[PDB]
Amino acid sequence: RFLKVKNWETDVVLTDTLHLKSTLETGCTEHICMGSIMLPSQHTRVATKDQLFPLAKEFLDQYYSSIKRFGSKAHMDRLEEVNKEIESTSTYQLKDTELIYGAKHAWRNASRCVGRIQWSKLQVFDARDCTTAHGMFNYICNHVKYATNKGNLRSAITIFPQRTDGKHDFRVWNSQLIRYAGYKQPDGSTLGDPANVQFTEICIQQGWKAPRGRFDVLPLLLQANGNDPELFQIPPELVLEVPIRHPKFDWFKDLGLKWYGLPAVSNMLLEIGGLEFSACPFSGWYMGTEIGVRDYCDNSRYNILEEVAKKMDLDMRKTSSLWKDQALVEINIAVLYSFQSDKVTIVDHHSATESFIKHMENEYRCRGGCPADWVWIVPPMSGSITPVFHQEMLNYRLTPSFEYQPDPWNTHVWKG
Ligand code: HEM
Ligand SMILES: CNCc1cc(Cl)cc(-c2cc(C)cc(N)n2)c1
Numbered sequence: 001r002f003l004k005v006k007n008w009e010t011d012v013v014l015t016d017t018l019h020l021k022s023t024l025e026t027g028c029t030e031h032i033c034m035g036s037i038m039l040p041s042q043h044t045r046v047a048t049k050d051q052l053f054p055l056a057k058e059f060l061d062q063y064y065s066s067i068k069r070f071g072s073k074a075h076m077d078r079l080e081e082v083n084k085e086i087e088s089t090s091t092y093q094l095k096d097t098e099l100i101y102g103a104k105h106a107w108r109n110a111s112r113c114v115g116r117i118q119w120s121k122l123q124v125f126d127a128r129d130c131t132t133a134h135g136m137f138n139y140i141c142n143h144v145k146y147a148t149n150k151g152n153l154r155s156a157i158t159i160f161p162q163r164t165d166g167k168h169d170f171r172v173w174n175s176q177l178i179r180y181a182g183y184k185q186p187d188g189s190t191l192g193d194p195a196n197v198q199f200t201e202i203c204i205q206q207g208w209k210a211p212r213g214r215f216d217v218l219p220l221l222l223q224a225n226g227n228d229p230e231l232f233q234i235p236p237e238l239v240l241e242v243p244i245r246h247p248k249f250d251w252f253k254d255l256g257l258k259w260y261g262l263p264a265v266s267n268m269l270l271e272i273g274g275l276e277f278s279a280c281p282f283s284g285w286y287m288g289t290e291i292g293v294r295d296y297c298d299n300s301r302y303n304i305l306e307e308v309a310k311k312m313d314l315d316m317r318k319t320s321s322l323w324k325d326q327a328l329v330e331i332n333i334a335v336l337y338s339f340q341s342d343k344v345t346i347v348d349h350h351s352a353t354e355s356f357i358k359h360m361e362n363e364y365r366c367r368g369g370c371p372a373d374w375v376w377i378v379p380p381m382s383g384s385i386t387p388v389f390h391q392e393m394l395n396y397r398l399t400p401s402f403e404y405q406p407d408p409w410n411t412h413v414w415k416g
């Protein structure tokens with residue numbers, strides 16, 4: 001009841017007691033392990049007033065235990081106050097302090113996030129007074145400008161009104177605030193980002209005038225209080241982009257690649273004391289490999305291993321010439337170098353995974369554990385030459401948390 005996780009590179013052992021506070025379920029049983037199911041039946045998100053208070057109490061007890069005013073009068077009164085409000089209003093409202101705590105700790109608990117060493121340094125923007133898609137557009141624009149900080153990227157989250165009935169729902173329909181468009185071609189192939197081809201088609205179905213190109217930043221599709229979503233284009237001066245060059249291969253610039261500096265996930269759901277925030281875009285900075293390995297070299301994404309290995313002049317006839325590997329490394333050297341030379345914040349997969357081991361040590365010390373999803377923490381290249389490969393990690397689900405949620409167009413009772 002006090003499990004141990006070993007690092008097999010360093011022979012370090014850490015004792016995990018935090019998993020005992022775990023509440024949610026993982027998907028695994030004693031007879032089957034789902035650790036590699038991407039969106040397990042559990043990881044996806046209507047409530048009742050009865051369910052709501054234990055979740056509120058449980059959350060409030062750890063918040064007051066975090067300011068070391070656990071069980072005091074200030075705590076018991078807040079327990080009573082929210083109990084009463086879940087009677088009166090069948091729900092409740094977080095204090096600003098509670099919102100900032102819960103949001104930080106949802107990140108802290110994000111077992112698939114390798115960046116969490118920064119969890120306490122998160123800027124929380126309270127958009128709970130927002131009422132229109134135009135207001136969402138405004139809060140998001142302030143979020144982009146703030147979190148971008150002229151390339152000195154800063155972690156932030158903007159938290160729109162919580163779900164109430166369900167049919168009134170604030171949603172950012174974009175999967176991220178800044179993403180490149182995907183256009184299928186008349187010959188079947190794909191321009192831009194193939195991930196977003198369906199989303200790009202939705203934006204055009206709502207009137208987007210597509211500049212049918214590669215790195216065309218998509219418009220925000222913002223749904224406010226259940227109403228139909230509306231298009232807004234982020235002021236281009238607010239979307240910071242890094243042109244990708246290589247520090248040796250001067251032909252690399254002719255590849256004509258770029259990426260945006262701000263990774264800002266917008267499709268997920270924040271849970272805080274039973275309250276559900278369906279629109280809560282959050283940003284940090286990139287680990288290089290998300291761009292250089294996944295964005296650029298996934299077969300179903302940009303898929304540039306072909307053209308890079310070409311210009312490198314590589315033994316491409318044979319699978320075993322590791323021409324794909326050799327061109328994957330150059331691509332990631334180039335992403336890193338380009339971002340660093342523009343002073344745009346980026347972390348390489350070695351520095352990031354080291355920070356996470358350090359972060360794990362702190363979490364087992366001053367917290368008793370650190371839920372971690374090996375399948376997601378190990379970078380998608382050079383796995384075993386990074387220290388997280390060698391670190392046993394216990395995955396368990398704690399709250400507050402970020403959850404997945406259905407895409408809004410599969411669930412929105414639309415009315416033209
Ligand atoms: C500050 C720098 C950050 C870095 C370097 C970082 C790094 C990463 C990476 C590489 C992933 C894997 C994504 C993929 O490869 O598909 C990830 C996932 C994730 N990040 Fe972090 N992140 C950062 C900040 C944040 C912030 C500020 C939040 C929330 C406020 C957050 C929440 C999450 C969540 C919830 C996931 C996983 C989603 C899931 O469960 O599937 N991250 N992060
Ligand atoms: C392949 N990248 C796609 C992707 C997917 C997801 Cl679920 C999260 C992030 C993400 C989010 C934040 C806040 C920082 C960061 N470095 N990455 C990126």
Ligand SMILES: C[C@H](O)[C@H](O)[C@H]1CNc2nc(N)[nH]c(=O)c2N1
Pocket residue numbers: 036037038375376377
């Ligand atoms: C099938 C598998 O679960 C899926 O490819 C996961 C594996 N690990 C991952 N790890 C990260 N960081 N990001 C991902 O998208 C994935 N994809």
Ligand SMILES: [Zn+2]
Pocket residue numbers: 028032033034035
């Ligand atoms: Zn398992």
